[PDB]
């Protein structure tokens, strides 16, 4: 599976979660930012590694990061 990590510069904007076409991510409560929430990656077994999440992330540098890793049928996006 691909590794997805969320770093503590997250501002809880939700844009990565909204961008994700495989429902890998979700928003969870947090104290660290004004939005009182942080992105989370509980379902990385469904991550295809498209990096739409990173495209969506407004912080500099990114607060979400996708490290491409061991390929599966899921991650390779195979319908056969």
């Amino acid at each position: 599976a691909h590794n997805v990590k969320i770093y503590d510069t997250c501002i809880g904007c939700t844009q990565c979660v909204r961008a994700c076409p495989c429902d890998v991510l979700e928003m969870v409560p947090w104290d660290g930012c004004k939005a009182l929430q942080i992105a989370s990656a509980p379902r990385t077994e469904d991550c295809v590694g498209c990096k739409r999440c990173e495209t969506a992330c407004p912080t500099d540098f990114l607060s979400i990061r996708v490290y491409l890793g061991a390929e599966t049928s899921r991650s390779m996006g195979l319908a056969y």
Binding site: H2, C47, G49, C50, R52, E71, M76, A79
Partner: protein, 739 residues
């Protein structure tokens, strides 16, 4: 009904200094150099500017007048160069021994060397556009007539430019006007094509016929009456064509056979000029005019009579095709992209038909034995056709992304095509592999066998034969048709099918083209290259909206670089990227077509005849034995025929030598864009920006590497320009020396 809104858009220069006014995204202005490129890329993407179909339609109509203005300026320039800077009149007097020229260069930095010795005491660039032959057929005999046509062109250009302005700014039609497709078809069939053809028949009969008959009999141009003399003095006409004594009474009384002197069905070619008989051309245009004027009464407009296009479409459905053509009328009256796709496909296909028909049935006097013009016209019109076909693919894909809706296409032909796209593309994939192996594979077999010293094992006319028997049989049908299945035709449509060797001067105009193994092989190469180009473009269209890999592709749009390195990597999935790849295959395909033409004509058609009747072909019949290996193409075509271009320095053909090298350069430069990616370039730019920041000379518009898509666009545009201009220079240098 005429429906218009008046005084819509003010005329001032306010927005000219507001770049990207037309787009919400661009109107805010640049933060980055990417904005500069986006401005140009998006300028004519009108449906991205607004959602209003009315607004889009108005811009298009007005832009079309703009295109027509540009074409009139160009046309006017050609006539003016004819009048002012050409050897037209000298050529008119001696067309066998003078080369046409209508461009003369100024003497700066030694470039006057390019003013070649074309004859008629004249020095200039030898032209290959066929203008002189066109003008001769039109009956133009002096520079005054060219000047006046040039002026008329500038008047038309100004009128088109006014209409463009007027119909955008002052009197813009409503959407309902544009959707009058029945009325548009009636007028374009009967009015534009029908009356156009009738009008040209009028010119042919009253001007071209007499003047050309006198020219061909050997009367000196200056001694021929001016066109209006034939109209005012009917006796001048009746001398040449006696049926003019009977006037128009035969027409109205249906004694049309009386006009069989100037309306003929001869076939073949005029022996003096080596062109089609103008009396056949006159009859062709009269017949076409009648058919088109009738065709343009098909559709219902403001009266009870005629067909509804919608009703025709809706009736055509059978047991294999669901709802059939239901819903197509709505597509083709609401989507400009759908219309553009069809019209580009047909216009491109037509250009290709014109290329073939004009070489084999040369319609102009002294065209056939002007080898540079024959080669140029075929090549030009093939390229225009190719580019239009790829455009059809682009606009078919844009339609699928932007204008298609499921609700409009429930179980109709469009819906049913996309529901078996895997069956279509898999079979086309297979046929491409089959064709590739059994066409190109035969050349590789032959190269291997000849290198191994086994000529008896080759596919060739003198070993294992692959005769194109069907083409050979059709050639025979066409050669025996006159006086048989075409009883009232005197001669073949074309001598390419069989029959006589036609010669003008001592040059061969046209003669039978034998088809053997080498012809069989190259025809299957064409089948191959066209099927692959189709595969790539069709795949782009059918998978534009989605695939198994990317289920939501339509949301990404027509033109996007990828959807990231995941799912194995998704570079070049977009519809746009299929057009990109399709351009290379169109380039590959058409290059071989024009190479086939060039070599076959030089080997087997063009050349000299003696008085005894001994044909001497330009490359002496080497095609049959040399064109069946890749080594033969490399050696006997590319290496041998490049001698002219490559030895051109220090002569009037030196421009072609320079263009040949220059074009190789642009081609190679394209590879920098095609083989690299912007990540590298953006990083390099960072270091360069560091040096500018250090010296307090960094721009506020921040430098960016080109977008991923722009990198591809720049790459293919330089690849095509370089590749095509190389062949242009090669062809012209060669054919101008030996032809």
């Amino acid at each position: 009904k005429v429906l218009i809104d008046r005084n819509v858009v003010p005329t001032n220069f306010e927005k000219w200094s507001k770049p990207g006014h037309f787009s919400r995204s661009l109107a805010k202005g640049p933060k980055t150099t990417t904005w500069i490129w986006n401005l140009h890329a998006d300028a004519h993407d009108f449906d991205s500017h607004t959602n209003s179909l009315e607004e889009i339609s108005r811009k298009i109509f007005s832009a079309h007048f703009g295109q027509l203005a540009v074409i009139f300026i160009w046309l006017s320039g050609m006539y003016f160069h004819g009048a002012k800077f050409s050897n037209y009149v000298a050529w008119l007097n001696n067309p066998i021994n003078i080369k046409p020229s209508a461009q003369v260069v100024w003497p700066i930095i030694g470039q006057e060397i390019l003013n070649a010795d074309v004859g008629g005491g004249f020095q200039g660039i030898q032209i290959t556009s066929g203008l002189f032959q066109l003008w001769r057929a039109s009956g133009i005999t002096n520079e005054m007539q060219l000047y006046v046509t040039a002026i008329g062109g500038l008047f038309m250009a100004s009128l088109m430019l006014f209409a463009g302005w007027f119909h955008y700014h002052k009197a813009a039609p409503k959407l309902e006007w544009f959707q009058n497709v029945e009325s548009m078809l009636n007028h374009h069939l009967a009015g534009l094509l029908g009356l156009g053809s009738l009008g040209w028949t009028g010119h042919l009969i009253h001007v071209s016929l007499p003047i050309n008959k006198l020219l061909d009999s050997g009367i000196v141009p200056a001694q021929i009456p001016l066109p209006h003399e034939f109209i005012l003095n009917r006796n001048l006409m009746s001398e040449l064509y006696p049926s003019f004594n009977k006037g128009l009474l035969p027409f109205f009384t249906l004694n049309w056979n009386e006009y069989n002197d100037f309306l003929t069905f001869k076939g073949g070619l005029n022996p003096v000029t080596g062109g089609l008989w103008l009396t056949d051309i006159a009859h062709h245009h009269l017949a076409i005019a009648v058919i088109f004027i009738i065709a343009g009464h098909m559709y219902r407009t403001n009266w009870s009579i005629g067909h509804s296009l919608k009703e025709i479409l809706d009736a055509h459905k059978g047991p294999f095709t669901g709802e059939g053509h239901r819903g197509l009328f709505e597509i083709l009256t609401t989507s400009w992209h759908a219309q553009l796709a069809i019209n580009l496909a047909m216009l491109g296909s037509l250009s290709i038909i014109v290329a073939h028909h004009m070489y084999a049935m040369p319609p102009y006097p002294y065209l056939a034995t002007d080898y540079p013009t024959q080669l140029s016209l075929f090549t030009h019109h093939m390229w225009i056709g190719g580019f239009c076909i790829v455009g059809a693919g682009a606009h078919a894909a844009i339609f699928m992304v932007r204008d298609y809706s499921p609700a409009q296409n429930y179980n109709n032909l469009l819906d049913r095509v996309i529901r078996h796209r895997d069956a279509i593309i898999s079979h086309l994939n297979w046929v491409c592999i089959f064709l590739g192996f059994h066409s190109f594979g035969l050349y590789i077999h032959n190269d291997t066998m000849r290198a191994l010293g086994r000529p008896q094992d080759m596919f060739s006319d003198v070993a294992i034969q692959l005769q194109p028997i069907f083409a050979q049989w059709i050639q025979n049908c066409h050669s025996i048709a006159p006086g048989n299945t075409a009883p009232n035709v005197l001669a073949t449509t074309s001598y390419v099918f069989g029959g006589d060797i036609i010669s003008v001067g001592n040059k061969i105009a046209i003669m039978p083209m034998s088809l053997g193994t080498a012809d069989f092989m190259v025809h299957h190469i064409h089948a191959f290259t066209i099927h692959v180009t189709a595969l790539i473009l069709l795949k782009g269209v059918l998978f534009a909206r989605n695939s198994r890999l990317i289920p939501d592709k339509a949301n990404l749009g027509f033109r996007f670089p990828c959807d990231g390195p995941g799912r194995g990597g998704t570079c070049q999935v977009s519809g746009w990227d299929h057009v990109f790849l399709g351009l290379f295959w169109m380039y590959n395909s058409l290059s071989i077509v024009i190479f086939h033409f060039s070599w076959k004509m030089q080997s087997d058609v063009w050349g000299t005849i003696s008085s005894s009747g001994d044909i001497s072909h330009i490359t002496r019949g080497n095609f049959a034995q040399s064109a069946i290996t890749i080594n033969g193409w490399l050696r006997d075509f590319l290496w041998a025929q490049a001698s002219q271009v490559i030895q051109s320095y220090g002569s009037s053909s030196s421009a072609y030598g320079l263009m040949f090298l220059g074009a190789h350069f642009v081609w190679a430069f394209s590879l920098m864009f095609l083989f690299s990616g912007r990540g590298y370039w953006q990083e390099l730019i960072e270091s360069i920006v560091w040096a500018h920041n250090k010296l307090k000379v960094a721009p506020s518009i921040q430098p960016r590497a080109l977008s991923i898509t722009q990198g591809r666009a720049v790459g293919v545009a330089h690849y095509l320009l370089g590749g095509i201009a190389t062949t242009w220079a090669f062809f012209l240098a060669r054919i101008i020396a030996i032809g």
